[PDB]
Each structure stands twice: as C-alpha cells, then as structure tokens.
Design an enzyme around this catalytic site. Sequence first.
Site, PDB file in Angstrom:
ATOM      1  CG  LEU A 100       8.213   0.840   1.595  1.00 40.55           C
ATOM      2  CD1 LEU A 100       8.566  -0.570   2.015  1.00 40.55           C
ATOM      3  CD2 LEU A 100       9.241   1.786   2.187  1.00 40.55           C
ATOM      4  N   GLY A 101       6.977   2.030  -2.742  1.00 44.34           N
ATOM      5  CA  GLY A 101       6.956   1.918  -4.191  1.00 44.34           C
ATOM      6  C   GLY A 101       5.561   1.728  -4.743  1.00 44.34           C
ATOM      7  NE  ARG A 102       0.067   4.083  -7.868  1.00 42.69           N
ATOM      8  CZ  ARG A 102      -0.703   5.083  -8.290  1.00 42.69           C
ATOM      9  NH1 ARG A 102      -0.159   6.224  -8.698  1.00 42.69           N
ATOM     10  NH2 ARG A 102      -2.023   4.949  -8.309  1.00 42.69           N
TER      11      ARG A 102
ATOM     12  CE  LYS B  37       2.717  -3.269 -16.536  1.00 44.22           C
ATOM     13  NZ  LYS B  37       4.181  -3.491 -16.363  1.00 44.22           N
ATOM     14  CE1 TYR B  38      -3.377  -3.637 -13.658  1.00 44.08           C
ATOM     15  CE2 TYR B  38      -2.200  -5.716 -13.670  1.00 44.08           C
ATOM     16  CZ  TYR B  38      -2.871  -4.720 -14.343  1.00 44.08           C
ATOM     17  OH  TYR B  38      -3.035  -4.811 -15.706  1.00 44.08           O
ATOM     18  CB  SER B  39       1.080  -4.104  -6.079  1.00 49.32           C
ATOM     19  OG  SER B  39       2.439  -3.857  -6.384  1.00 49.32           O
ATOM     20  CD  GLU B  40      -0.417   3.346  -4.011  1.00 52.38           C
ATOM     21  OE1 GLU B  40      -1.055   3.658  -2.977  1.00 52.38           O
ATOM     22  OE2 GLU B  40      -0.600   3.893  -5.123  1.00 52.38           O
ATOM     23  CB  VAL B  41       5.219  -1.847  -1.744  1.00 49.44           C
ATOM     24  CG1 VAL B  41       5.940  -2.597  -0.624  1.00 49.44           C
ATOM     25  CG2 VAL B  41       4.889  -2.794  -2.894  1.00 49.44           C
TER      26      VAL B  41
ATOM     27  CG  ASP C 107       8.877  -9.923 -12.629  1.00 50.76           C
ATOM     28  OD1 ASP C 107       9.591  -9.562 -13.601  1.00 50.76           O
ATOM     29  OD2 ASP C 107       8.203  -9.123 -11.950  1.00 50.76           O
TER      30      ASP C 107
END
Length: 326
Positions: free
Chosen positions: A43-45, A47-51, A154
């Site tokens: 779904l997305g990327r 800094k320190y996370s892949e969804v 954020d």
Amino acid sequence: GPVPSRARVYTDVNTHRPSEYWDYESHVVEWGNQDDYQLVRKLGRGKYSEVFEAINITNNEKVVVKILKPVKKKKIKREIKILENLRGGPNIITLADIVKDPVSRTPALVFEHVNNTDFKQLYQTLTDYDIRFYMYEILKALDYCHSMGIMHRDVKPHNVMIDHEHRKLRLIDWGLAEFYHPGQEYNVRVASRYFKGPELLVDYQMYDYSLDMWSLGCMLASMIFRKEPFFHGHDNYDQLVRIAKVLGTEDLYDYIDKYNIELDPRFNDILGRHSRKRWERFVHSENQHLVSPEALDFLDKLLRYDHQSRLTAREAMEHPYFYTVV
Ligand SMILES: CCC[NH2+]Cc1ccc(-c2ccccc2)c(Cl)c1
C-alpha cells in the site's frame, strides 16, 4: 532561558493517571501469530515502515499490516501503547493485533482496513460542505486523543484516510505520537516540514496539543484555497520564512518575545520584513466556492504563531464554521 508554557486544556490528564497508562517503556507487548494473515499487496512505504493490504485467513476479513524496521525498540513500544490506549476512540485507526514474523522476527502492527478513496479525483469534486464535514471528523479524533493526554505530532493529509463512499475517516500513523506531560521539553524533529508549527521551527521545546491545531490549519488552508502545500518551505528555516510571508514578521517577534525564545542565527539573512496578509488575498476563481467569512475566521484562529492563542480542538468544534454539520 525560554519562558515555560503548558496546554490550556487537558493539562494534567497524565499526571492523575497511573504510570501503567503513560510508561510505555515498561509496557509488556505480546505478539500474535503472523500465520493468521496473508499479505495481498503493498500500500505504501515510509521511512521505517512498509504498509500492506492483508487477509485475516481465520475470518476472510481484510486488514492492514504495518511492518516496522526495528531501528528503535523504544519508539515501537510508544506507538503500541498509544494505539492500545486510544483503541475505539472516534476516527482513530483501530489496532487489531501485534504480530512478529516467526522467521525474520520483524514487528508488525495489524489494523482495521480502510478503503481510502483516491484523493486526486476527490480534491476536485469536494464541496464547501465536504471540507466542513471531514474537518469536524478530524477534530473528533484530535479532541479525543488530546483528552487522553496524547499529541499526534504528525497531522497531515497522508495521515488521514477517507472512505468517501461510506463517509468514514481515520487518523493513522501514531509513530510520532507522544504523551503530554506539563513542563516536558520535547524533540522538535517531528511532523512533516509543511505542517510544522512555528514552535518547532524556532526550537521551542515546551510545546503541547496545540501543535496538532497548527498542522490542521495548514491542511484546512490547502483545501479551501486549493494550494498544496499552503506554506511551501524548501527547508526548516525557509519554512518559517514562508509562514512569516503570510502572518507577518511583527507578530513573529511578539511570539518570540513572549516566550523569551532565542532566534537561530540562520534566520538573520533570510527572514526579512513582511506585512501581515489578509486571508481574503488567497481567494481566487478556482477556490472561491470553498471559501466563506466563517472559514476565514476559523482559519485565522488556528494559524497563529502563539500556540496558546490557537483554538483547542473542542473550541474549534464549537466554531460557526461547523453550524451546518452533524
Ligand atoms: C493516502 C492519502 C490520504 N489522504 C486523504 C485525504 C486526507 C485529508 C483530506 C482533507 C484535508 C483537509 C480538509 C478535509 C479533508 C483529504 Cl481531501 C484527503
């Protein structure tokens, strides 16, 4: 040194609660079984996370899996504790499970699925009413998390999921969220550049929930004036200059005098002198159908240098801009 400050609302909510509530370092995290989830697509990327979009195989239900690159255990614990504390709050993303890969042992957060409508087709069709409606849904999420002693830190369009068909809204990515403790000095390296409050850009560490109200005003201004982003800085210092080009340098010096803030020497040659601009000057033929005196009065009460002078989420929900909503 700098003058101290505290939130005007929910000031002592964490002081009156047991450590178990806010002591995220001591919170015990228990990992589920990642075998219950089948990953479907990226779904997305971050800094320190892949969804990822996933399927919970035990009930054929769609979920969202956020795989985190474990670069800081403390940060992961903070996000988990805040998500658990806020679970079931209005328009807050629901954490359903916390899981680890049996092999790589990478932490992963499992959330309720949100069918986010493509905003690029949404932005042009949204009406005066839709902006009032969705702004109130975000305020619900913020009044709730602030009442729970948490600042999101954020707030931005990428962290707001909208299922337009079902008129459903969720405030996501609580990775930068923090517990508000009166008198605490926080790291100013939070929020995305365009949404950073003046307190952060002038390095004033004793900020509060009102930071989220600045960020919200930036999204409101970009939506009603069709100018994305509204304050388009090229760095953190330039970001203050873009703000000063609108709010003026006069009120900026009043703000830093009020809190005895020391303005960084990098601002000496870039800041210049700017008059306070009328919000009406941003009205054009492309956006006049979304602008109203109520919207401009509302925006003027959020986009203020003085973090204490900004509307709280509850005062904002009571503004005449929201009379036609709910
Ligand atoms: C994955 C990108 C998700 N972004 C969706 C989105 C988030 C927020 C808004 C919004 C901003 C200000 C006022 C009202 C609504 C919109 Cl239009 C779209």
